[PDB]
Amino acid sequence: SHMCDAFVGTWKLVSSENFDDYMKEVGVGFATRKVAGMAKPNMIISVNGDVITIKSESTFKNTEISFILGQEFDEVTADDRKVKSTITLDGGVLVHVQKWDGKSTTIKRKREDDKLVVECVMKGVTSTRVYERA
Numbered sequence: 374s375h376m377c378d379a380f381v382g383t384w385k386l387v388s389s390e391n392f393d394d395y396m397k398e399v400g401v402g403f404a405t406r407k408v409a410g411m412a413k414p415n416m417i418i419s420v421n422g423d424v425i426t427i428k429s430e431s432t433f434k435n436t437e438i439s440f441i442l443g444q445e446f447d448e449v450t451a452d453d454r455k456v457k458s459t460i461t462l463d464g465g466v467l468v469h470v471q472k473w474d475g476k477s478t479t480i481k482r483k484r485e486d487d488k489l490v491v492e493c494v495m496k497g498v499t500s501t502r503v504y505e506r507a
């Protein structure tokens with residue numbers, strides 16, 4: 374066992390707040406914002422040795438990353454940005470930083486009660502997305 378075990382499983386989106394404005398701040402265009410905002414993704418998190426895999430599955434995109442904590446990787450995001458990403462575990466929170474074109478956004482994933490809470494921030498704009506077990 375590892376501490377990341379509290380994240381493993383299949384999670385379904387149950388609430389979203391401020392996501393459209395977060396996407397505006399990131400630079401997502403209108404049509405992608407509208408279709409992304411309508412999505413009700415599942416998030417599937419698994420661990421195999423040191424490798425963590427996070428899959429986002431929805432109508433109009435399935436996206437998957439695999440990574441080792443603390444080891445930078447190239448990522449193509451659901452909105453088609455090419456970013457450099459690093460994910461670490463800090464005090465029980467998975468912290469995902471994405472860097473591209475002199476910009477940065479941080480995505481935190483935390484277990485709170487029976488929820489997986491995703492907090493997304495860029496400059497001062499935050500969105501909170503709440504998942505429950507599927």
Ligand SMILES: O=C(O)C1=C(C(=O)Nc2sc3c(c2-c2nc(C4CC4)no2)CCC(F)(F)C3)COCC1
Nearest residue numbers: 396401408409412414431432433434451452493502
């Ligand atoms: O995992 C999340 O809840 C989180 C995100 C998420 O779900 N984004 C989703 S799902 C999903 C889409 C996107 C999406 N994002 C973005 C920009 C904001 C990154 N552009 O498109 C597009 C296609 C789809 F509609 F078919 C399905 C995004 O960032 C934070 C955590």
Ligand SMILES: [Cl-]
Nearest residue numbers: 442443461462
């Ligand atoms: Cl770490």
